[PDB]
Amino acid sequence: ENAENEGDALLQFTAEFSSRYGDCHPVFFIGSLEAAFQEAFYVKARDRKLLAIYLHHDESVLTNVFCSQMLCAESIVSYLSQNFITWAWDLTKDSNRARFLTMCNRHFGSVVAQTIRTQKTDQFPLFLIIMGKRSSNEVLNVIQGNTTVDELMMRLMAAMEIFTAQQQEDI
């Protein structure tokens, strides 16, 4: 379908963000969002993990601090990247803004995208967590952004223990 190169697009960002903020940062997966999913759910039953979309919005005043505030920790970045799948998407410009909405609209749903529209800008960054379902990808938790780095730890770790319990063996 009509789409633009993601991998490269992300690279340029990862490269800048590196210097802009600093070397210390969570390993950003280079490729197409599609993979960020398969490599999470469709991944080896052993390498099974969860995905976490990190929306980066300049307009937001937090996105700045939150970066060196929460995305500054080594345990969070290392764990979020190792345990979970770290993925960033620059939706600053409208062009990108809509794009994402369109993708999520289907991938996730209409009730999901709409929410993003209501979610103010300050709230950002918006950290979402997906469990993954053959039928369709659905989120389990949606953090505004003014949360505490600590909350992220439990929020992430929990999503893991919860998932295992959610899924079944028969079905």
CSV table of N, CA, C and O in Angstrom, one decimal, residues 23-91:
chain,number,residue,atom,x,y,z
A,23,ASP,N,24.3,10.2,24.2
A,23,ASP,CA,24.5,8.8,23.8
A,23,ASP,C,23.5,7.8,24.5
A,23,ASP,O,23.0,7.0,23.9
A,24,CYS,N,23.4,8.0,25.8
A,24,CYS,CA,22.5,7.2,26.6
A,24,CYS,C,21.1,7.3,26.0
A,24,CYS,O,20.4,8.3,26.2
A,25,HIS,N,20.6,6.1,25.5
A,25,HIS,CA,19.3,6.1,24.9
A,25,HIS,C,18.9,4.6,24.6
A,25,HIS,O,19.8,3.8,24.3
A,26,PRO,N,17.6,4.3,24.6
A,26,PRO,CA,17.1,3.0,24.4
A,26,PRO,C,17.2,2.6,22.9
A,26,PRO,O,16.9,3.3,22.0
A,27,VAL,N,17.8,1.4,22.6
A,27,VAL,CA,18.0,0.9,21.3
A,27,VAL,C,16.7,1.0,20.5
A,27,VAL,O,15.8,0.2,20.8
A,28,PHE,N,16.7,1.9,19.5
A,28,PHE,CA,15.5,2.0,18.6
A,28,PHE,C,15.5,1.0,17.5
A,28,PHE,O,16.5,1.0,16.7
A,29,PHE,N,14.5,0.2,17.4
A,29,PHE,CA,14.4,-0.8,16.3
A,29,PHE,C,14.3,-0.1,14.9
A,29,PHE,O,13.4,0.7,14.7
A,30,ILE,N,15.3,-0.4,14.1
A,30,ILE,CA,15.3,0.1,12.7
A,30,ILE,C,14.6,-0.7,11.7
A,30,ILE,O,15.0,-1.9,11.4
A,31,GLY,N,13.5,-0.3,11.2
A,31,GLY,CA,12.7,-1.0,10.2
A,31,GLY,C,11.3,-0.5,10.1
A,31,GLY,O,11.0,0.6,10.3
A,32,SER,N,10.4,-1.4,9.7
A,32,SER,CA,9.0,-1.1,9.5
A,32,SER,C,8.2,-1.5,10.7
A,32,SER,O,8.3,-2.6,11.3
A,33,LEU,N,7.3,-0.6,11.2
A,33,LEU,CA,6.4,-0.9,12.3
A,33,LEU,C,5.9,-2.3,12.3
A,33,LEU,O,5.8,-3.0,13.3
A,34,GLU,N,5.5,-2.8,11.1
A,34,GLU,CA,5.0,-4.1,10.9
A,34,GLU,C,5.9,-5.2,11.6
A,34,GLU,O,5.4,-6.1,12.3
A,35,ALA,N,7.2,-5.0,11.4
A,35,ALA,CA,8.1,-6.0,12.0
A,35,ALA,C,8.1,-5.8,13.6
A,35,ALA,O,8.2,-6.8,14.3
A,36,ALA,N,8.0,-4.6,14.0
A,36,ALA,CA,8.0,-4.3,15.5
A,36,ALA,C,6.9,-5.1,16.2
A,36,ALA,O,6.9,-5.4,17.4
A,37,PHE,N,5.9,-5.6,15.4
A,37,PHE,CA,4.8,-6.4,15.9
A,37,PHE,C,5.2,-7.9,15.8
A,37,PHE,O,5.1,-8.6,16.9
A,38,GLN,N,5.5,-8.4,14.6
A,38,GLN,CA,5.8,-9.8,14.4
A,38,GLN,C,7.0,-10.2,15.3
A,38,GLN,O,7.0,-11.3,15.9
A,39,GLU,N,8.0,-9.3,15.4
A,39,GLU,CA,9.1,-9.6,16.3
A,39,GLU,C,8.8,-9.6,17.7
A,39,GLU,O,9.6,-9.9,18.6
A,40,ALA,N,7.6,-9.2,18.0
A,40,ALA,CA,7.1,-9.1,19.4
A,40,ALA,C,6.2,-10.3,19.7
A,40,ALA,O,6.4,-11.0,20.7
A,41,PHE,N,5.2,-10.5,18.9
A,41,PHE,CA,4.2,-11.6,19.1
A,41,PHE,C,4.6,-12.8,18.2
A,41,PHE,O,4.7,-13.9,18.7
A,42,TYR,N,4.8,-12.5,16.9
A,42,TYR,CA,5.1,-13.6,16.0
A,42,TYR,C,6.5,-14.0,16.2
A,42,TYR,O,7.1,-14.8,15.4
A,43,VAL,N,7.2,-13.5,17.3
A,43,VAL,CA,8.6,-13.9,17.6
A,43,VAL,C,8.6,-15.3,18.2
A,43,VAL,O,7.6,-15.9,18.5
A,44,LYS,N,9.9,-15.8,18.3
A,44,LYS,CA,10.1,-17.1,18.9
A,44,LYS,C,9.4,-17.2,20.3
A,44,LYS,O,9.5,-16.4,21.1
A,45,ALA,N,8.6,-18.3,20.4
A,45,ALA,CA,7.9,-18.5,21.6
A,45,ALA,C,8.7,-18.3,22.9
A,45,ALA,O,8.2,-18.0,23.9
A,46,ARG,N,10.0,-18.3,22.7
A,46,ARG,CA,11.0,-18.0,23.8
A,46,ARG,C,11.3,-16.5,23.9
A,46,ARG,O,11.4,-16.0,24.9
A,47,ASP,N,11.5,-15.9,22.7
A,47,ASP,CA,11.8,-14.5,22.6
A,47,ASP,C,10.6,-13.6,22.7
A,47,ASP,O,10.6,-12.5,22.3
A,48,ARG,N,9.5,-14.2,23.1
A,48,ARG,CA,8.2,-13.5,23.2
A,48,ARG,C,8.3,-12.3,24.0
A,48,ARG,O,8.9,-12.3,25.1
A,49,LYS,N,7.8,-11.1,23.5
A,49,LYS,CA,7.9,-9.9,24.1
A,49,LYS,C,6.7,-9.0,23.7
A,49,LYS,O,5.9,-9.4,22.9
A,50,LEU,N,6.6,-7.8,24.3
A,50,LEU,CA,5.6,-6.9,24.1
A,50,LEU,C,6.1,-5.6,23.3
A,50,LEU,O,7.3,-5.3,23.4
A,51,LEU,N,5.2,-4.9,22.6
A,51,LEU,CA,5.6,-3.7,21.9
A,51,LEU,C,5.1,-2.5,22.6
A,51,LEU,O,4.1,-2.5,23.4
A,52,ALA,N,5.9,-1.4,22.5
A,52,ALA,CA,5.5,-0.1,23.1
A,52,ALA,C,5.8,1.1,22.2
A,52,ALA,O,6.9,1.5,22.0
A,53,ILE,N,4.7,1.6,21.6
A,53,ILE,CA,4.8,2.8,20.7
A,53,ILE,C,5.1,4.1,21.5
A,53,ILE,O,4.3,4.5,22.3
A,54,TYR,N,6.2,4.7,21.2
A,54,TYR,CA,6.6,6.0,21.8
A,54,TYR,C,6.4,7.2,20.9
A,54,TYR,O,7.2,7.4,20.0
A,55,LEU,N,5.3,7.9,21.1
A,55,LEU,CA,5.0,9.1,20.2
A,55,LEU,C,5.8,10.3,20.7
A,55,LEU,O,5.8,10.7,21.8
A,56,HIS,N,6.6,10.8,19.7
A,56,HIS,CA,7.4,12.0,20.0
A,56,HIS,C,6.8,13.3,19.4
A,56,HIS,O,6.8,13.4,18.2
A,57,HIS,N,6.4,14.2,20.3
A,57,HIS,CA,5.8,15.4,19.8
A,57,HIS,C,6.6,16.6,20.4
A,57,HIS,O,6.6,16.8,21.6
A,58,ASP,N,7.2,17.4,19.5
A,58,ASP,CA,8.0,18.6,19.9
A,58,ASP,C,7.1,19.6,20.6
A,58,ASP,O,7.4,20.0,21.7
A,59,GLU,N,6.0,20.0,20.0
A,59,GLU,CA,5.1,20.9,20.6
A,59,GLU,C,4.9,20.7,22.1
A,59,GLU,O,4.9,21.6,22.9
A,60,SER,N,4.9,19.4,22.5
A,60,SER,CA,4.8,19.0,23.9
A,60,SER,C,6.0,19.5,24.7
A,60,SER,O,7.1,19.5,24.2
A,61,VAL,N,5.7,20.0,25.9
A,61,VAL,CA,6.8,20.5,26.8
A,61,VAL,C,7.4,19.4,27.5
A,61,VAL,O,8.6,19.5,28.0
A,62,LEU,N,6.7,18.3,27.8
A,62,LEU,CA,7.2,17.2,28.5
A,62,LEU,C,8.2,16.4,27.6
A,62,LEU,O,9.3,16.0,28.0
A,63,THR,N,7.8,16.1,26.4
A,63,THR,CA,8.6,15.3,25.5
A,63,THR,C,10.1,15.7,25.6
A,63,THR,O,10.9,14.9,25.4
A,64,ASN,N,10.3,16.9,26.0
A,64,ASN,CA,11.7,17.4,26.2
A,64,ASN,C,12.3,16.8,27.4
A,64,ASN,O,13.3,16.1,27.3
A,65,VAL,N,11.7,17.1,28.6
A,65,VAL,CA,12.2,16.6,29.8
A,65,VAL,C,12.0,15.0,29.9
A,65,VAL,O,13.0,14.3,30.2
A,66,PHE,N,10.8,14.6,29.7
A,66,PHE,CA,10.5,13.2,29.7
A,66,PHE,C,11.6,12.3,29.0
A,66,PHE,O,11.9,11.2,29.4
A,67,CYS,N,12.2,12.9,28.0
A,67,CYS,CA,13.3,12.3,27.3
A,67,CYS,C,14.5,12.0,28.2
A,67,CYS,O,15.0,10.9,28.3
A,68,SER,N,15.0,13.1,28.8
A,68,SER,CA,16.2,13.1,29.7
A,68,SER,C,15.8,12.7,31.1
A,68,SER,O,16.6,12.6,32.0
A,69,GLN,N,14.4,12.6,31.3
A,69,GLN,CA,13.9,12.3,32.6
A,69,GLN,C,13.6,10.8,32.8
A,69,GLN,O,14.1,10.2,33.7
A,70,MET,N,12.8,10.3,31.9
A,70,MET,CA,12.4,8.9,31.9
A,70,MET,C,13.3,8.1,31.0
A,70,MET,O,13.8,7.0,31.3
A,71,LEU,N,13.4,8.6,29.7
A,71,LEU,CA,14.2,7.9,28.7
A,71,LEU,C,15.7,8.1,28.9
A,71,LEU,O,16.5,8.0,28.0
A,72,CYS,N,16.0,8.5,30.1
A,72,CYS,CA,17.4,8.8,30.5
A,72,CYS,C,18.0,7.6,31.3
A,72,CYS,O,19.2,7.4,31.3
A,73,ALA,N,17.1,6.9,32.0
A,73,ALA,CA,17.6,5.8,32.8
A,73,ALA,C,18.1,4.7,32.0
A,73,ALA,O,17.7,4.5,30.8
A,74,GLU,N,19.0,3.9,32.5
A,74,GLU,CA,19.7,2.8,31.8
A,74,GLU,C,18.8,1.5,32.0
A,74,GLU,O,18.7,0.8,31.0
A,75,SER,N,18.3,1.3,33.2
A,75,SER,CA,17.5,0.2,33.4
A,75,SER,C,16.2,0.2,32.6
A,75,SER,O,15.7,-0.8,32.2
A,76,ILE,N,15.6,1.4,32.5
A,76,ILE,CA,14.3,1.6,31.8
A,76,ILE,C,14.6,1.3,30.3
A,76,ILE,O,13.8,0.6,29.7
A,77,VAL,N,15.6,2.0,29.8
A,77,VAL,CA,15.9,1.9,28.3
A,77,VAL,C,16.4,0.5,28.0
A,77,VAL,O,15.9,-0.1,27.0
A,78,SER,N,17.2,-0.1,28.8
A,78,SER,CA,17.8,-1.4,28.6
A,78,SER,C,16.7,-2.4,28.7
A,78,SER,O,16.6,-3.3,27.8
A,79,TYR,N,15.8,-2.3,29.7
A,79,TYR,CA,14.7,-3.3,29.9
A,79,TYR,C,13.7,-3.1,28.8
A,79,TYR,O,13.2,-4.1,28.2
A,80,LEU,N,13.2,-1.8,28.6
A,80,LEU,CA,12.2,-1.5,27.6
A,80,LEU,C,12.6,-2.0,26.3
A,80,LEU,O,11.8,-2.4,25.5
A,81,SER,N,13.9,-2.0,26.0
A,81,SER,CA,14.5,-2.4,24.7
A,81,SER,C,14.7,-3.9,24.7
A,81,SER,O,14.3,-4.6,23.7
A,82,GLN,N,15.2,-4.4,25.7
A,82,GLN,CA,15.5,-5.9,25.8
A,82,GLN,C,14.2,-6.6,26.0
A,82,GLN,O,13.8,-7.5,25.2
A,83,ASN,N,13.5,-6.3,27.1
A,83,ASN,CA,12.2,-7.0,27.4
A,83,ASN,C,11.2,-6.6,26.4
A,83,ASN,O,10.5,-7.5,25.8
A,84,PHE,N,10.9,-5.3,26.3
A,84,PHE,CA,9.9,-4.8,25.3
A,84,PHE,C,10.6,-4.3,24.1
A,84,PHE,O,11.8,-4.3,23.9
A,85,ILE,N,9.8,-3.9,23.1
A,85,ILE,CA,10.3,-3.4,21.8
A,85,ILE,C,10.2,-1.9,21.7
A,85,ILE,O,9.1,-1.3,21.6
A,86,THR,N,11.4,-1.3,21.8
A,86,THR,CA,11.4,0.2,21.8
A,86,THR,C,11.2,0.7,20.3
A,86,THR,O,12.0,0.3,19.4
A,87,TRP,N,10.2,1.5,20.1
A,87,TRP,CA,9.9,2.1,18.8
A,87,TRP,C,9.4,3.5,18.9
A,87,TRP,O,8.5,3.8,19.7
A,88,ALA,N,10.0,4.4,18.2
A,88,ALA,CA,9.7,5.8,18.2
A,88,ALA,C,9.1,6.3,16.8
A,88,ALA,O,9.5,5.7,15.8
A,89,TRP,N,8.2,7.2,16.8
A,89,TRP,CA,7.6,7.7,15.6
A,89,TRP,C,7.4,9.2,15.7
A,89,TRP,O,6.6,9.7,16.5
A,90,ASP,N,8.1,10.0,14.9
A,90,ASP,CA,8.0,11.4,14.9
A,90,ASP,C,6.7,11.9,14.1
A,90,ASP,O,6.7,11.8,12.9
A,91,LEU,N,5.7,12.3,14.9
A,91,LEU,CA,4.5,12.7,14.3
A,91,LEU,C,4.3,14.2,14.5
A,91,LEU,O,3.2,14.8,14.4
